[PDB]
Design a protein around this ligand. Structure first.
Ligand SMILES: C[C@@H](Oc1ccc(Cl)cc1Cl)C(=O)O
Ligand SMILES: O=C(O)CCC(=O)C(=O)O
Ligand SMILES: O=C(O)CCC(=O)C(=O)O
Ligand SMILES: [Mn+2]
Ligand SMILES: [Mn+2]
Lengths: 289, 267
């Protein structure tokens, strides 16, 4: 049982698939080795973990994030004054632009080495509205038939940011506001990189599906017509409701998600209400089979 | 080659018109061999002006293999082997074969070929479409080819004459088959008889089969044959698909056909 396996923290799973609430620890302070190792174990098992009631400073947020790996801010988001490492998911009450992250994805997979994790901190969130969905790409992979696994396990996939800040974004109407999003070079938006469709997580050693509808363009080697259906099936499969969990925010909730083996999604159900979280990004290494 | 027959290809994909031969007569070795060469190359071949009897029709068909009638068609009186594709002028409803398919793939060994003979056909209307599954396979990307070449597909007749017992019987064929005569690889799927990719769930299988149906039936993989009375046509039932065209309402249309038996589709 969790109560006896964990001696320094308390772990309460959110679903039978992923997600867990962690209590019994003070993120204002340096973590001792035994406490950190339990958090890291829970992180690898539950893939998204969150800590209610952690009223921390920007420096403490950064220090906690550093336990997971080096900081490596994502390219698109603005930072707060004085802290380049601390980026903003901020939406003013009156804004009407596109909501950041409102499609299932994982972050910045157009990079040669996308983030390994993100540590998000709620600053000011609505009493209701603005939950975040998560899902497990371990589960998505593990629930494919043996025949479908054999069929796709050796494929590679082309990623780019073209629909977020490259040529395709610039040729359409739904735009982000300047509250949290920077102006970007279109050529950087169009730059392609190739990642495996199935990857091995370096911490857990487990295989997971690695495709997302925001940044994936096509299966490498295939035409668009050939790719379109396999990719669309995999998006529908991965985002099956029974592979998900739903996290509700409260002020001072600190959450870590695994940027390799989960996906996540914003929920734009709080029009007219201010919502502000900060986040630090933990750098990763090239996705690999 | 072609010293004994004259061959005029219809498109750059498949189909050819053959002249300079009299199908009422027995074919010598050199002439038969050229016809078979043209058949393997062009996949659908047709001979205008061949006013052949029922017996000559059967005899020509036997050069391709054993004459083994498809299960569901009516035979003309006196000749079990010779079956009817007949529609009356006063007839309404929909037409036999009005979806892209190839014949009877629910069988463990579907027909190898069909020899069709126009008896009474409209001045215009009632063309037959054909397409090449060699070309369909060869135009898939190398990556898609590698991705699906090891898949097998479950066929059954449930939607033609089954529930939707012999109509519910399943058989499994390779998704990509090697032609036993030409040695060439072709795609082997069709929307009439294919049920699912073996081993996959419905959600996994449906989009992939649907893409392959869309790909194979791309217009640029097709040809279109117009009929005239006394035209004799042979199609390869393994490496082509075909489709009737119901654009002749009010007009009588009558063709006969013999069916040539095949062997198990093989990788
Ligand atoms: C910050 C995040 O950027 C986005 C991801 C998905 C979507 Cl739909 C939009 C944005 Cl800005 C990222 O990918 O790093
Ligand atoms: O605002 C949220 O709930 C998630 C936004 C998001 O996708 C992100 O911060 O990367
Ligand atoms: O009538 C036609 O053009 C073709 C009908 C058909 O599919 C067949 O005879 O197998
Ligand atoms: Mn995101
Ligand atoms: Mn037919």
């Amino acid at each position: 049982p969790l109560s006896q396996r964990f001696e320094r923290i308390a772990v309460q799973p959110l679903t039978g698939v992923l997600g867990a609430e962690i209590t019994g620890v003070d993120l204002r302070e340096p973590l001792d080795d035994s406490t950190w190792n339990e958090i890291l174990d829970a992180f690898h098992t539950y893939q998204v973990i969150y800590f209610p009631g952690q009223a921390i400073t920007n420096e403490q947020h950064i220090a906690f994030s550093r336990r997971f790996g080096p900081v490596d801010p994502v390219p698109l988001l603005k930072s707060i004054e004085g802290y380049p490492e601390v980026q903003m998911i901020r939406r003013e009450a009156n804004e009407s632009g596109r909501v950041i992250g409102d499609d299932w994805h994982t972050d910045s997979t157009f990079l040669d080495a996308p983030p390994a994790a993100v540590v998000m901190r709620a600053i000011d969130v609505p009493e209701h509205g603005g939950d975040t969905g998560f899902l497990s790409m371990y589960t998505a992979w593990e629930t494919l038939s043996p025949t479908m696994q054999a069929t796709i396990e050796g494929l590679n996939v082309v990623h780019s940011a073209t629909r977020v800040f490259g040529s395709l974004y610039q040729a359409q109407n739904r735009r982000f506001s300047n509250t949290s999003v920077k102006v970007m070079d279109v050529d950087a938006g169009d730059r392609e990189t190739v990642h495996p469709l199935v990857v091995t997580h370096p911490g857990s050693g487990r295989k997971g599906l690695y495709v997302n509808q925001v940044y994936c363009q096509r299966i490498e080697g295939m035409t668009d017509a050939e790719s379109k259906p396999l990719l669309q099936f995999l998006y529908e499969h991965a985002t099956r409701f029974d592979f998900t969990c739903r996290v509700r925010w409260k002020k001072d909730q600190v959450l870590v998600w695994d940027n390799l083996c989960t996906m996540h999604r914003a929920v734009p159900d709080y029009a007219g209400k201010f919502r502000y979280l900060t986040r630090t990004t933990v750098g990763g290494v090239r996705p690999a089979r």
